[PDB]
Design a binder for this molecule. Structure first.
Ligand SMILES: NC(=O)c1ccc[n+]([C@@H]2O[C@H](COP(=O)([O-])OP(=O)(O)OC[C@H]3O[C@@H](n4cnc5c(N)ncnc54)[C@H](OP(=O)(O)O)[C@@H]3O)[C@@H](O)[C@H]2O)c1
Ligand SMILES: CCc1nc(N)nc(N)c1OCCCOc1ccccc1N1CCC(C(=O)O)CC1
Length: 168
């Protein structure tokens, strides 16, 4: 289950959420957590990362494409271009690698969920209620089985915990 044969197409989702399920607001993530940034890099490095066009927009121009990973951006706009990366019009076109991490945002998590067999979640204990127009984490049905870590404490003074979910 843990090994990925090279002829397969494994799809995982990775996200960080507040306890309310908020993942994004106003084109940004409404907190910063260094431990989550390190965790995201550790999981995704060396693999293909797939993101929605609005998540590409949310990365500073100087930092994208993200290093050490093949960057794929989803857009329906025939004139949207992502310098340094590949833009495709569907998840089917994006999922050609043996191991793909979908890195957001809310629309693309919902789109990719039917094909995903792993989710890696960071939950931040920050009280941020859901507001209209927020991007939200996908909801996971009972086909998913999860492990929840104990609450840990960030150098930034926020509690956080990690979840790992899997399905067949
Ligand atoms: N906390 C986290 O872990 C995390 C991670 C990533 C992002 N974020 C945040 O989440 C927010 C962005 O999320 P979002 O839901 O607004 O947008 P998104 O999922 O990042 O991108 C949505 C865009 O993807 C394209 N798209 C969607 N469905 C498609 C399909 N079926 N085929 C092809 N292209 C498709 C469209 O691009 P076009 O409009 O160009 O057609 C659409 O506008 C930001 O606030 C960002 O900072 C948070
Ligand atoms: C790190 C945020 C994050 N967390 C988990 N758990 N899942 C995700 N999908 C996810 O969003 C990745 C795309 C947005 O990124 C950022 C947003 C705000 C601050 C920092 C970052 N990043 C730090 C690492 C860097 C890199 O890895 O090069 C890319 C930029």
């Amino acid at each position: 289950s843990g090994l990925v044969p090279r002829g397969s197409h494994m799809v995982g989702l990775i996200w960080a959420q507040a306890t309310s399920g908020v993942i994004g607001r106003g084109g940004d993530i409404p907190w910063r957590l260094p431990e989550d940034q390190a965790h995201f890099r550790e999981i995704t490095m060396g693999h293909t990362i797939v993101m929605g066009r609005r998540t590409w927009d949310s990365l500073p121009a100087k930092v994208r494409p993200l290093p050490g990973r093949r960057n794929v951006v989803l857009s329906r706009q025939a004139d949207f271009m992502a310098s340094g990366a590949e833009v495709v019009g569907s998840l089917e076109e994006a999922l050609t690698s043996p191991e793909t991490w979908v890195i957001g945002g809310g629309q693309v998590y919902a789109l990719a969920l039917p094909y995903a067999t792993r989710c890696e979640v960071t939950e931040v204990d920050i009280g941020l209620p859901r507001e209209a127009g927020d991007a939200l984490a996908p909801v996971l049905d009972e086909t998913w089985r999860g492990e929840t870590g104990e609450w840990r404490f960030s150098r930034s003074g926020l509690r956080y915990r990690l979840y790992s979910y899997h399905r067949s």
